[PDB]
Amino acid sequence: LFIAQLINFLLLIFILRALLYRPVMNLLNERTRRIEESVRDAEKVREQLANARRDYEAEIARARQEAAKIVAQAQERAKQQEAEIIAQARREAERLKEEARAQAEQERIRMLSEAKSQIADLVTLTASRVLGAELQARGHDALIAESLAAL
Amino acid sequence: GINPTLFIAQLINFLLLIFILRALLYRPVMNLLNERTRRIEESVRDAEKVREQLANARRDYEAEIARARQEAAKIVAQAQERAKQQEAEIIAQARREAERLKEEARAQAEQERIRMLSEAKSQIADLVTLTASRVLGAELQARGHDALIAESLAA
Amino acid sequence: PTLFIAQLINFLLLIFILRALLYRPVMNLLNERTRRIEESVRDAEKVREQLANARRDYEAEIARARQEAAKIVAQAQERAKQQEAEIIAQARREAERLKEEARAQAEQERIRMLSEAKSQIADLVTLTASRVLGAELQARGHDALIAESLAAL
Amino acid sequence: GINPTLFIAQLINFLLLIFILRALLYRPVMNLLNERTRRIEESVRDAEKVREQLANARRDYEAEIARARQEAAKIVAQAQERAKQQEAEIIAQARREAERLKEEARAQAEQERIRMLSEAKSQIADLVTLTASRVLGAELQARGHDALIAESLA
Amino acid sequence: MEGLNLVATALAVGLGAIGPGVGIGIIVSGAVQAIGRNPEIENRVVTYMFIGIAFTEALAIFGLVIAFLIGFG
Amino acid sequence: MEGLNLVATALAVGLGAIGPGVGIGIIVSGAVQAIGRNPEIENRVVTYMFIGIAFTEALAIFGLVIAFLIGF
Amino acid sequence: MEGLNLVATALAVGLGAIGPGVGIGIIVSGAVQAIGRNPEIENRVVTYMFIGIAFTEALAIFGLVIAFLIGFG
Amino acid sequence: MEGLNLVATALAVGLGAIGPGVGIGIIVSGAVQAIGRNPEIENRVVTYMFIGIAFTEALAIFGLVIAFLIGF
Amino acid sequence: MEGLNLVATALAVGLGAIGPGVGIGIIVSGAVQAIGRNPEIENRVVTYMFIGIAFTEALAIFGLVIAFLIGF
Amino acid sequence: MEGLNLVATALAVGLGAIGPGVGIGIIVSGAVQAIGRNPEIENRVVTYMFIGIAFTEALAIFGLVIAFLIGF
Amino acid sequence: MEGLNLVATALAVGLGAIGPGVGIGIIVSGAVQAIGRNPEIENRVVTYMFIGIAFTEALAIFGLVIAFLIGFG
Amino acid sequence: MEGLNLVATALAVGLGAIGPGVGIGIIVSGAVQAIGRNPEIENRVVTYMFIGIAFTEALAIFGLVIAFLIGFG
Amino acid sequence: MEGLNLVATALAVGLGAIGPGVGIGIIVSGAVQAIGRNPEIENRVVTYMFIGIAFTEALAIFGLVIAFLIGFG
Amino acid sequence: MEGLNLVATALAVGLGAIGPGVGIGIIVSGAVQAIGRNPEIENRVVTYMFIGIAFTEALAIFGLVIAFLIGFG
Amino acid sequence: VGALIISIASRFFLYTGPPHVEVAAEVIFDGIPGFPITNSFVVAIIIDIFVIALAVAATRNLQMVPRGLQNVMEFILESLYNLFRNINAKYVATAFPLVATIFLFVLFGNWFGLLPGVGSIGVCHIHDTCAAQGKKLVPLFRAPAADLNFTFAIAVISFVFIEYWGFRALGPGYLKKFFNTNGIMSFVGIIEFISELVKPFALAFRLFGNIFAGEVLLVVMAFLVPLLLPLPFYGFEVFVGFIQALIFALLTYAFLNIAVT
Amino acid sequence: IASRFFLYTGPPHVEVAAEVIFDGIPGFPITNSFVVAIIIDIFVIALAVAATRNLQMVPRGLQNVMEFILESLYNLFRNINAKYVATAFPLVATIFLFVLFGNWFGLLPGVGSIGVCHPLSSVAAAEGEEIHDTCAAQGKKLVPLFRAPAADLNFTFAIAVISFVFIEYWGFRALGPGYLKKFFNTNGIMSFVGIIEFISELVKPFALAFRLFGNIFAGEVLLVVMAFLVPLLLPLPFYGFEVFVGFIQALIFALLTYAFLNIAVT
16 A cells, blocks of 8 residues: 555656656746846846946046046137237237338438439539539630531 | 534634734735835836936036137137237337338438538539540630639539 | 328329429420530531631632732743843943944044144144244344334334 | 348349440440540630631731742842843943944044145145235245245145 | 336427427527628528428427327327 | 336426527527627517527427426 | 337437437528528528438438337337 | 435436536627627627526526425 | 337437437538538539538448347 | 435436536637637626636536435 | 347447447538638548548447447357 | 446446536637637636636536445445 | 346447547547648648547547456456 | 446446547647647647646546446445 | 318328338249349349330430430439549549449439339238238339348449459559558558448448338338328438439449549 | 556555544544644645745745745736735635645545554455555554545535635625625516526535535545555556646635635626
8 A cells, every 4th residue: 555655656756857847947947037137127226226326426527527627728728829829920020010120221221322313413414514504614615626527 | 524513613713714814924915015116116216317317427528518618719819809909019019110210211311411511512523523524625624614613513 | 002002192293293393404404415515516517617618718828829929920021021121222222322423423523633634734834934934034124024013103 | 131142143133234234335425425525625626727727828828929029029130130231231332332433433534644735735825925915015035935834844 | 117108208308309409509590690791691591590490390399299199099 | 116207207307408408508609699790680680589599498398398297 | 118118119209309400400500601601502502401401301200210110019 | 116206306407407507608608709709789798698598597497496396 | 128129229210310410410511611611612522521421321320220120 | 126316316416517517618618719819808708707607507516416415 | 137138239339320420520521621721632631531530430330340249149 | 226326326427527528628629729829818818728627627526526425425 | 137238338339439439520620620721730730630539549449448348257 | 136337337438438538539629720820839739738638538537447446346 | 282281181091001011131022943033133123124225225326416315314424424533533434334333223223112012012922912811911122222132232342343443553552551550550550441341331231221211211101191291201212312322322432532542 | 667567565445434533532523634734734834934034035945936826826816806916815825825735735645544543465366455454453444644634524615615705795895785786686687697696606615615625535535546456657647637636726716716706896
């Protein structure tokens, strides 16, 4: 009687461990993995929310600090260049103003060269002045006769 | 087995077992339910916080351009106004120097005019001597040019 | 016994019933089958007649084809002799025209040489006159002509 | 009914029936049906041949006419070639003969040299009146030109 | 042993009614369904339905009358 | 025996429940399906359904009244 | 037993009236549902329906004949 | 003999179970399928289903009452 | 036990009527259903329909023949 | 003759198994098909399906109870 | 008592006929429906339907030969 | 007579096998067909099928238990 | 009783023809119906059909064995 | 009066073949009909088919056990 | 006609007596020192003569256009040929004569059994005619298919034909089937073998039982009411005789078809 | 494989009898079903507190499978009705688990082999063994001290009646006077069907109790008979069927209870 029940029970388990072992293990493994992804997933709703504050703090700090520094560094580079280039061209304008000083020298040259220009009317046109004053009284009758002979 | 005493005892045992179920079943039920509720609340929290963080970093980068926009705007204003004043001053310096240079030139010309009064008689003597060869025979006084030359010098 | 008369009356009634409700369908189905046979019979003989006529038409059409073929060719032979003759006759008529115009051209060319020689002898007598006129004016002085030339002025 | 002898007798009776029936009407009815289905299938077969005969008759009649005109045009061209080559022969023969007729006539017209042998009658006499009567006062008394005129007239 | 007549009559009526009952049920179900699919052929449907019902009722009536013949002499 | 009448009426009522019961079941199932597929002809199909029900119940009543007469 | 003849006749009717009844019902329902769609085959489907009805009535009438033979020796 | 009444009552109840049981089974299956096909005519088809079930169970109750009468 | 052969004959004929009768009914219903759904296949169907009819009638005729042998 | 009560009880229980068993089978198959067709009506169909099972089991319980009454 | 052999033979034949008749009926109905739906699979349809009808008829023949052994032997 | 108890046990077990066997067969066929047509509602179809099997096999076990009670009480 | 063994063998073989006969019939009908529906799943269909046929024939074999045991003793 | 045990054993075997045989037939027909229209659902449906087959065979085993018990006491 | 038929009660004036026609076997009609002549062999010979006469009458002219009797003879042969062509392709000509003969013969046999005088006219060895004398009455012209020997004969020749044309077509493959499959055709094969073995038994029993049931139905309806009552049954019987003939032919051809394939 | 099914060692016969009343030396007599019922209650409470004393997220081991079963029960009962999916859950869950473990107890060796008593010996050429039992002395019967709790008509009746009372009370919890509207409302034929409805409602607990008791007792008896027929290698599929059907019926009882509750409230 007892041997009848014992032999049947062990052999039944031996074929249950051959067929109804892998799927029954796999179902509990799949649920445990889902809870492994889901208990973790629930810690995450709050874990990502905690990470959201970390992400917000990191992003704001990284951006605003760098934005303030880079823009001001760009501003300082530009502001310095704004005054410098403005003053740099002013000396070039003063260099153009030095050309007026050169133009003054050219004007100075013009008046200095006018020491013969207006004098020419006094000198080259004082030849006929002497024709009327010095030449007029001077007796050049002999010269006139010589010119007539040359004719 | 049909007796009233056994049936009543079985009913009492069933009632006790049912009554005992209230305290025990509330444990695992709460264990499964509390977890889910906490998870849902934390999920709402995550949605909110993540949305907030994402919508703020983009605006910070927008303010980076806005900070650069003010940086560029100040640059042009500083450059243009300074250059305009510098150009105006330089041109005014050029204008002032133009008045000075021209005035000095005119003064020198006026000075030279009277100073050359030593040149009217100079050209008189030039006609007396250089025009002598231009007239007849390089005779400076010719035959009367001497006294006449004096009159030309007086003129 | 009564069994025989019962069987007889029952069988008579069955025969009457069958004649009532089955004589017409059987007879009309048989008539339809006979008509289907006859249509096939009429179809077969018509096709046989069609083939015989189609066969007969084939030799009949090719027969007139031969008749039209030789008739066309004979017309071509008839046209060949006429076309060949007219070209020869045109050429023969043309050749005579060349013979006549050659005679006129040659006769005209004879007159052309006749006029050419007339111009030649005029040229020689004119050219020789100039030669002897110069020789004659070697002896008699040119003054007579020169004095005459001024007198005409 | 158990007796195998009468069983076999009935069997043999029925076998004799199937043989006599298959020999009596089955072969006639089967071969009649076969001949009938041959007749209908050849009727379709002959109907196709009817169309082929009609198509062939139309085509071959046109083909016979076409080969007639092609041969007819061929003999026509051959006559044309013979005529043109004969006509050109006649024209060329006439042309050459006409040219030799011109040449002989021109040679026959070359007699103006013979007629130029009467220069004494005309050339000398006309020269005298041309020199004297018209271009001068007809006073050609100076001689010696008669040697000049005969010398140059040849 | 004299009650066998009553048992016979009861068996006859009951077993001659069970078959035709199911037959009539199936007939009416099929006819009603076919009419539901198409109401315009309902005349011929009803005609053949009564034909089949008449056959089944003829079988049931044969059973009933032979039960009466068994029940009586 | 002296109880064969009881067996008779019992068998008659039982088979009268057997046959017409299944007939009623099939009739009602078919009629309900036809009504569900098309409600516009509901009156006509219900009339035909009740006609079939009447025929089957007539068979059942025949069996039951035979059992009634036997019981007496 | 003395009363077995009546029970035999009743059984031969009743049991023989079951299968034919169901067959008649099934045949009629099938024919009606078939004629519901495309009634243009009415003649042929009625022909086959009547062949089937003849076979079912054949079985039923064999039962009836056997019962009548038993009831009258 | 003695148990003829018992056999009669048992047979009557058993046959009134085999017939109407299948009848109401077919009724309920057809009605449920029709409801799944058409929920809009649910009230009408449920009324008809209950009418058929009432008739079938009435036949079964007739069988039970006959059995109780025989037992009494 | 006189009349027992009669009950034997009755039972044989009854059951041989029950079985093949339902078989014939089912066969004919299926055949007409298929013909109505597709009339063109009727020529192919009718052969197998008659084959099945013969196969069904085989058992009923077996029953009737055995019943006649038992009776005689 | 021995106790026919045993045979009566056996017949009653057996036929109460025969009928409502097929009734329940047909009911459940029809309900499952209707659910497969329309899951949106699952509450209504499971309610009516349990109603039908209740009626079939009521017939079977009637059979079992009268079997117990026959036994005692 | 003395006629139980006849009842045995009759019951054997009848109960051996009642089942396989319905079996072959439903076989032929299914095969007919399949042929009406798909004629291209007809060869396999015929083979399988005849295999099934052979099985069911073999059951019927088992019943009939058991009845023959009962009647004689 | 004498061995009626064994006959009763056999009859009860046999009919309990007759009924619920057909019920289980029909239930399983319907459930399998619905699952094959709708492989997504099996999560409820399987449960409904099993609770139907409960109600079917309950009657078979009723018959079996009654048979053991008669044969052992 | 002198008989009751021939009757036993008759009943066993007859009901074993009843059940498995209808089972095999329904198996073949469904299989050929699916084959007409699906031609290329024929191997799996035939395998499952023969598995069901063997399972159904197991009961008929049991009935035949019981009948032979009774006949031999 | 004496051979009743043989009759009971035969009845138990026969009806335990009647019930589960039709159950298995219906189960296999439904399974093959479902698998014809859905090949990949075979892994799901074969399990339920074997479940129903096991339940029907369990009923048949109940019948066989009862028959063997009463065939030896 | 009115449905109020009053001749329904003719049994009082015309009572046919008990159905004495109950013989399941033959009776000797022609006393002969040789083998006995059954009441069915004589009608077999009669049907042979009738079939031969109709065949020769329908083939004495062999008209191309079938009309009258020729058309009637040709139509049934056309129908059978078309039917067997639908069943099988290349075995129509090989098996056609036997199947057509076995159809026609049993057709005319069953149609003869409805002729009047079959159950009544008979040779001497309510009370019929012979029983008035001391001699018993045996019937005359018993249907051929009613006799078991003829049905067994046609069944066994059908079995011989199918076995010969399976063996000839498939060689030794048909002779032993495929028992050595051992996978499927080791238990299916024996079932097919016993089915083939019992096939002639079923074929003969079908005709025998159908015709016997027909004639006893005729006699029973005569016994009950011998007026207007057996008319629907007689119509059914003349229908079912042709039906059974066509059935026997169709099944023997289809069995040959399934055997060769 | 096919030669080791020796019948030389086995039970002498097959023993069938309702649970035997225990000795009950003190007052308030008990049965062998009551003691196994109490021990299975103890086992259930022990497993419940084992899953309870360690309650935490991501369950593993016994607690994981327990929560699987509990949430599967929630999903199954939710598909019927979510209105009372939790209110009635403890009762059906407890009855389910206890019936499960009671049906599991029937497979344990010693059930029917242990007697509280208030080869050569086997018969040759026989299918069943004939070895006399340990308690065969004193004309005793070897009363099974260990038995299936549901194989007794006292527990099954008790859970049936308590389930019926629970269902009727929760229907009466919120339905008003709608019960009389469902029972013989005297509205055409609606009155008639309510009577059968009322009778069915009355016989539902009796049907459940009889069904469960019969199932379990039949399983025990068939296992005993299969052991008697052939001792080893024969009853394996039937033992598997029993271990299946025990759990199956255990879930069926709770599912039917919930379904009856829903059909009463709706």
